[PDB]
């Protein structure tokens, strides 16, 4: 069956938006295209820095970007050198002067993107999909998750026929609107096609 996107359906009810900047009809189109350029640049430059969530908010004549990552030391660098090279080029893209804020992700196994990116990297390293699913589940439940399930689909292990398989531990309600559900999607680009990774993480209610 077809599933609705669980993170987008819960925006504003129990999940805050990843962008909260306001603008009227005049500058909304230019700034939204400016958001796509900065999210693509911070993902490409910091792909090995485990960046999972980018918060973009805009004051009246400025912009500050909050980078949620589990490894701040690559993002900070030696005394802010890596931050300084990023703050100068975001202001070139956005036009207004910019600022780089860094929020530390305490547990990467509870954030849905870094669980999906870890399985994305291991399937390229010839780690088995039975093992790759099993490590991310057990590491999340021991850190205080009430439930987690992960799904992979399409050419598992280089087989010709695409197959679907999902494992579940705990309790993950998809139809409860109070359910804190963290969901994001990552694709495993291997030599034998694309492997989709879906991660559902339940963090409690209300």
């Amino acid at each position: 069956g077809q599933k609705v996107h669980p993170n987008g359906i819960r925006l504003g009810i129990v999940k805050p938006w990843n962008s909260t900047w306001f603008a009227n009809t005049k500058e909304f189109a230019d700034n939204l295209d400016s958001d796509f350029k900065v999210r693509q640049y911070l993902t490409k430059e910091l792909a090995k820095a485990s960046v999972s969530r980018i918060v973009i908010e805009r004051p009246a004549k400025s912009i500050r970007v909050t980078i949620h990552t589990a490894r701040p030391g690559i993002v900070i660098g030696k005394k802010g050198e890596d931050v300084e090279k990023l703050r100068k080029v975001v202001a070139d893209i956005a036009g207004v002067p910019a600022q780089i804020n860094i929020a530390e992700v305490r547990k990467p196994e509870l954030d849905a993107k870094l669980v999906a990116d870890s399985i994305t990297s291991q399937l390229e390293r010839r780690v088995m999909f039975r093992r790759a699913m099993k490590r991310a589940v057990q590491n999340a439940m021991r850190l205080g998750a009430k439930g987690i399930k992960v799904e992979v689909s399409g050419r598992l292990g280089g087989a010709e026929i695409a197959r679907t398989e999902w494992y579940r531990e705990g309790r993950v309600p998809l139809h409860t609107l109070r359910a804190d559900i963290d969901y994001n999607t990552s694709e495993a680009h291997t030599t034998y096609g694309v492997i989709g990774v879906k991660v559902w993480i339940f963090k409690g209610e209300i």
């Binding site: 993170n7 987008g8 504003g12 962008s19 909304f28 939204l32 295209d33 796509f36």
Partner: protein
């Protein structure tokens, strides 16, 4: 769309602010003036020698991310599918699936 097709759209906009922004704006007014030059304004003939690709009627509003000429929205500047992928990841502020 194709990379050559988006290169055509940049070529039209760069000529649109070049030629038809201020020069054809004057030529549209003088041909419309009822008070003076009722017979021999000849502004239409000078518009003929201008290049065609400066026209706002020839340009096509397309997605800034992929280049799809279908499903454009002036609110987002994107195609209908790419609006969804930014909405579900929370990249568009305040945008959510609605019920009424």
């Amino acid at each position: 769309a194709k990379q050559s097709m988006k290169a055509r759209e940049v070529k039209r906009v760069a000529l649109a602010d070049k030629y038809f922004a201020k020069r054809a704006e004057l030529k549209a007014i003088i041909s419309d003036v009822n008070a003076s030059d009722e017979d021999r304004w000849n502004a239409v003939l000078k518009l003929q020698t201008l290049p065609r690709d400066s026209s706002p009627s020839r340009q096509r509003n397309r997605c800034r991310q992929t280049g799809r000429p279908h499903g454009f929205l002036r609110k987002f500047g994107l195609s209908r599918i790419k609006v969804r992928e930014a909405a579900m990841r929370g990249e568009i502020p305040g945008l959510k699936k609605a019920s009424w």
